[PDB]
Symmetry: C3
Subunit: 138 residues, 3 copies
């Protein structure tokens, strides 16, 4: 088909836009809010999906941050690695390879974000990567 627009909404009413394509048992979905661009002939700017502390569930265990989501599609995706910037309450920040999945719980989609230990409490996680999941349905 052609690519259909859609979105998820976070606990704090942040809107995560995506485009998707669904064929037989296949669902391919890309998040489109942070598609980086070259703004001139020589500079590439990354864009962030910015996820705040209030977007995550509590308690968090094992450097696993869970973003309950409302609306959009309901998939058990594979894991994709992303560029993360993990910002602490003290404004210190750590660049990490994160690992992201979409999963379903209580009929709600949730985004699972896993990363490494940091010396403090998290204020914000920024996903600097353009995320696309290829998923198998059923």
């Amino acid at each position: 088909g052609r690519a259909t627009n859609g979105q998820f909404v976070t606990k704090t009413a942040k809107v995560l836009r995506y485009k998707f394509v669904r064929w037989d048992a296949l669902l391919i979905i890309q998040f489109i809010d942070n598609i980086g661009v070259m703004e001139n002939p020589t500079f590439y700017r990354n864009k962030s999906i910015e996820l705040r502390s209030a977007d995550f569930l509590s308690p968090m265990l094992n450097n696993t941050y869970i973003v309950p989501l409302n609306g959009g599609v309901r998939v058990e995706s594979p894991t994709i690695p992303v560029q993360l910037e993990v910002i602490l309450e003290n404004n210190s920040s750590f660049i990490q390879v994160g690992f992201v999945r979409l999963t379903v719980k209580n009929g709600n989609p949730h985004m699972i974000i896993q990363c490494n230990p940091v010396p403090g409490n998290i204020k914000m996680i920024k996903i600097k990567s353009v995320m696309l999941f290829t998923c198998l349905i059923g």
Copy 2:
């Protein structure tokens, strides 16, 4: 099509289950043994594909562990990065970004797992990520 079940079997008779879809020149395959789940409203549990020392070929060079496989499909996949937990003979363990491919040798599929140096001999590698390969056939 709809997603067809299948599996590979390791040298020690471990069974690695997958689902796949094959269209024109495309083969998309997901391993399904370790699909993590939220077990309650607040806890996500990762599941592991556990690969033992006896599943790998010897000698191993350059932190490259090769798992000869029997049965299933025969593809030259791209490389996917995964979450690994590399467990040493002394029960010490290291969390790593691994890189995985499927390749064919002697008409047998083999899984290529590459990671970083560790201070010791490996007893076990656990893949904590949900793996899906998108492959081009011919």
Copy 3:
């Protein structure tokens, strides 16, 4: 369809070959120059896409190396993580998880390669991973 051959060419006339498949809004493209192989029953050899200093734009900022490309297809791909070997002018080298995208600027495709800080100036980046992008067109 079946997989169509194609290529990009770098500023220094290096040829990057790929195969691709284009369906409705989907474009899937794999680079094929560095498909690793088992050369015997026990040894896997990685192959490199080797990108020289002269293939990149200047100035480089924020450990972002941009390879202007000519020919081939024009896509805004998602980000894929790769195995990189970053070789310095002093022949010292660092193994890294890189992050790669294809982007379009001035109607030209460009390959965006992002990695970590290194103690020196870069002579060469080797991509040791088999790269495939799944892309959404429009």
